[PDB]
RNA sequence: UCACAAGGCUAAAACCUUAUGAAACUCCGAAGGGGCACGCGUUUAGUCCGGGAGUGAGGCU
RNA sequence: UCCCAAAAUGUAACGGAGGCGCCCAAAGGUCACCUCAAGACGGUUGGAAAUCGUCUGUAGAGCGCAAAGGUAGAAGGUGGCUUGACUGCGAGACUGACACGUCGAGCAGGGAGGAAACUCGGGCUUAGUGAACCGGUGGUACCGUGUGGAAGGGCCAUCG
RNA sequence: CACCCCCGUGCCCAUAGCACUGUGGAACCACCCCACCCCAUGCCGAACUGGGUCGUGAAACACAGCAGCGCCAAUGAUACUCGGACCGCAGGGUCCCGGAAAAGUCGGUCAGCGCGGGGGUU
């Protein structure tokens, strides 16, 4: 919510650091994107009941069931079946869930000195998915079964990777050293 | 020699040779004169022939290649019931088309290794040297 | 058609009218399992709705 | 993408229907509803809005849709076929419609 | 699209230079061929309706 | 269906490959909306391939099955309502020795989706079929023998 | 269309395309702002869409530069070929006379033609 005005603490934090021509010409962050991709093996009604409750309580948003891209390799695969779950979070609820992260997700991480600062989207965007589920403000072991993990990808209108780097970091992000 | 997988079967026709009538890969090059067919063994022949002559070992460019399935019916049947199983394989070498390029040996080695090569084939032949310069 | 075929059985559509009429087509029987409700014309009037008769 | 516009553009079977194409541009807050014989590469009506609209924004619809249909009835052009482009037909351009659907 | 001659290069597949084969390959593509029109310039046939058929084993360059 | 088939249709072979005798109640009518295969980077199970993300991206995909032609302004992918997989017809043509077979504007009765102009008498198309005869069945009241009735028969439908 | 220029739309279906690039903001476009209901997401105002600005010229769009790529492409010459003739047992080949590509080379090109509208030329 307030992270809005924080974005606006960044707007000339780099418009005065860089030397841009304009204020819209500085990297915004369209959507955060969450992928709960069990799949390959896990074909139970219960783990998608669970992935549903989980996603819909943590980000307060209905989850879309992404299916088998007709990819039926040698192993256990076929055509019309859930091999990945998705919840796109953008703007408002994006800023809210990302704040849920930096506030009540990032410290909660068991063993954590920051995350991977190597050049992500060579176009200058980002991803970062992360294992563990037992590091949360919403995901409780007292409200789940066994352990899962998330996979997240944030999009940043940066031109290059140093500019996304800077963006993400001045926004409230730890880059391990 | 033979190929890997394909269609299976064929037919035949003639009229002059497309490309490549030019001396690439080598300094010296032997060139067909007759609208032949040529077989796996007919060329492996010249492989082993010239490869005798050059010793260790030259540099030998077989510019031709068998891709044609030729058949023969089972011996002794009256025609009908089929087309012949695939007897052997054929490179459909037309004239002016160049079959062999070598270098990494001298002029004498080209003359002779090509002589011995061409004494193994259904064709009169001429050996020569480069200058065909449309594209190296 | 081909007698001992159990799916796509050929059955007719008798009018709810009672005109004295029937259409004729083919349900997969791995589908309906109860009957069929269709809305075809009927020369002896105009627009009946038909029950998939035995 | 473009798709939708060119889709409707061809489902207006260019001239072969006989009638008259009716454009729109409700994607800005300056629109452009037009009238075309499409076969003849000419335009025959023209209800703009950039030379002072009224004051309204999407209420302006029925109004330039009444101005157009007026310039139409004046020209003589008494029959419709409704082009669009990327537009749903529901609200704004739907108003333009209703008040052109009885407005000329 | 299947094939395949050398070489590059990487972890080979791709892809670059060099390179070629195809009835079931086709960026390309004639000569001819066919329909319609005209007859601008020659020549004789055509088409319909009704009677009688025979032929329906073909052969060679 | 594809070469063979000599750039028009056609054409044989105990010549060269392959497929059909169904399927679809939605996979049809309409209305609206969405765009594909892959490769690179980067990412929890994974990690050749799964899911997500971005840059590339005119077809290198998809069409229930065979391939060829076709297709991205959709025929491909998703929903809303739906029974045009409709009777009475048939201008005009493709095709065949015949019998068949194929396409079809438009008219009527009467509908379906659109707000509309519209579109539809089955599916992208070309395989998914059997002439007569004898008989079953649902209508129909044309024939029924001195007469009026009924058997039986005809006509439309249809089943083997 | 009076001159430029922008908005919608067509004939033309790449000598009209892409990338590299510079111009471009109240004058149109776009982003942007918010959305409880219209209306919509197989989840989300991302998109369809309802409220309206400033703001930004960035992105997208429009214009201009640009021959690196794509596209287009000669003449000459050849292949093949109608029809005249012929040679070789044959695989095949020649002669006369016309038609005559493909690919390559010369090069050529940031299209060209409309209608209506809005908006400016102290
Ligand atoms: Mg070219
Ligand atoms: Mg006979
Ligand atoms: Mg004969
Ligand atoms: Mg012919
Ligand atoms: Mg014959
Ligand atoms: Mg009999
Ligand atoms: Mg009866
Ligand atoms: Mg009776
Ligand atoms: Mg001749
Ligand atoms: Mg000549
Ligand atoms: Mg010429
Ligand atoms: Mg330009």
Swiss-Prot record, chain A:
UniProt entry keywords in alphabetical sequence: Ribonucleoprotein, Ribosomal protein, RNA-binding, rRNA-binding, tRNA-binding
A GO MF label: tRNA binding
Pfam families from the UniProt entry: Ribosomal_L5, Ribosomal_L5_C
Residues in coiled coil: none
Highest taxon listed in the record's lineage: Bacteria
Keyword Transit peptide: no
A cellular-component GO term for this protein: cytosolic large ribosomal subunit
Keyword rRNA-binding belongs to the record: yes
Biological process terms in GO annotation: translation
Cysteines paired by S-S bonds: none
NCBIfam families: PRK00010.1
Membership in a protein family: Belongs to the universal ribosomal protein uL5 family.
Function: This is one of the proteins that bind and probably mediate the attachment of the 5S RNA into the large ribosomal subunit, where it forms part of the central protuberance. In the 70S ribosome it contacts protein S13 of the 30S subunit (bridge B1b), connecting the 2 subunits; this bridge is implicated in subunit movement. Contacts the P site tRNA; the 5S rRNA and some of its associated proteins might help stabilize positioning of ribosome-bound tRNAs.
Subunit structure as annotated in this protein's UniProt entry: Forms a bridge to the 30S subunit in the 70S ribosome. Part of the 50S ribosomal subunit; part of the 5S rRNA/L5/L18/L25 (CTC) subcomplex. Is known to contact the 5S rRNA, 23S rRNA and the P site tRNA.
HAMAP family given in the database record: Ribosomal_uL5_B
Protein name, UniProt field: Large ribosomal subunit protein uL5
Swiss-Prot record, chain B:
Name under which the protein is recorded: Large ribosomal subunit protein uL16
UniProt KW keywords: Ribonucleoprotein, Ribosomal protein, RNA-binding, rRNA-binding, tRNA-binding
HAMAP family recorded: Ribosomal_uL16
Role according to the record: Binds the 5S and 23S rRNAs and is also seen to make contacts with the A and P site tRNAs. Interacts with A site tRNA mimics, and is probably one of the key factors, along with a helix of the 23S rRNA, in positioning tRNA stems in the peptidyl-transferase center.
Pfam families per UniProt: Ribosomal_L16
Gene: rplP
UniProt-listed GO biological process terms: translation
GO cellular component terms, A-Z: cytosolic large ribosomal subunit
GO molecular function (one): rRNA binding
NCBIfam families attached to this UniProt entry: rplP_bact
Subunit-level organization: Part of the 50S ribosomal subunit. Contacts the CTC protein (RL25).
Curated annotation (Swiss-Prot), chain C:
Top-rank taxon: Bacteria
A molecular function (GO) term: rRNA binding
GO cellular component, as recorded: cytosolic large ribosomal subunit
Gene3D superfamilies: Ribosomal protein L33 (2.20.28.120)
BP GO annotations: translation
InterPro entries in UniProt: Ribosomal_bL33 (IPR001705), Ribosomal_bL33_CS (IPR018264), Ribosomal_bL33_sf (IPR038584), Ribosomal_zn-bd (IPR011332)
Sequence similarity: Belongs to the bacterial ribosomal protein bL33 family.
Classification via PANTHER family: 54S RIBOSOMAL PROTEIN L39, MITOCHONDRIAL, LARGE RIBOSOMAL SUBUNIT PROTEIN BL33M
The protein's assembly and partners: Part of the 50S ribosomal subunit. Contacts protein L35.
Function of the molecule: Binds the 23S rRNA and the E site tRNA.
Protein name: Large ribosomal subunit protein bL33
Organism per entry: Deinococcus radiodurans (strain ATCC 13939 / DSM 20539 / JCM 16871 / CCUG 27074 / LMG 4051 / NBRC 15346 / NCIMB 9279 / VKM B-1422 / R1)
Gene designation: rpmG
UniProtKB/Swiss-Prot annotation, chain D:
GO cellular component: cytosolic large ribosomal subunit
Alphabetical list of InterPro entries matching this protein: Ribosomal_uL18_bac-type, Ribosomal_uL18_bac/euk
GO molecular function terms attached to this record: 5S rRNA binding; structural constituent of ribosome
GO biological process: translation
Matching Pfam families: Ribosomal_L18p (PF00861)
Function in brief: This is one of the proteins that bind and probably mediate the attachment of the 5S RNA into the large ribosomal subunit, where it forms part of the central protuberance.
Organism of this sequence: Deinococcus radiodurans (strain ATCC 13939 / DSM 20539 / JCM 16871 / CCUG 27074 / LMG 4051 / NBRC 15346 / NCIMB 9279 / VKM B-1422 / R1)
Quaternary structure, from the entry: Part of the 50S ribosomal subunit; part of the 5S rRNA/L5/L18/L25 subcomplex. Contacts the 23S rRNA. Contacts protein L27 and the 5S rRNA.
Gene, per the UniProt record: rplR
Domain of life: Bacteria
Protein's recorded name: Large ribosomal subunit protein uL18
Keyword terms of this UniProt record: Ribonucleoprotein, Ribosomal protein, RNA-binding, rRNA-binding
Family of the protein in this entry: Belongs to the universal ribosomal protein uL18 family.
Keyword Cell cycle: no
Keyword Chloroplast: no
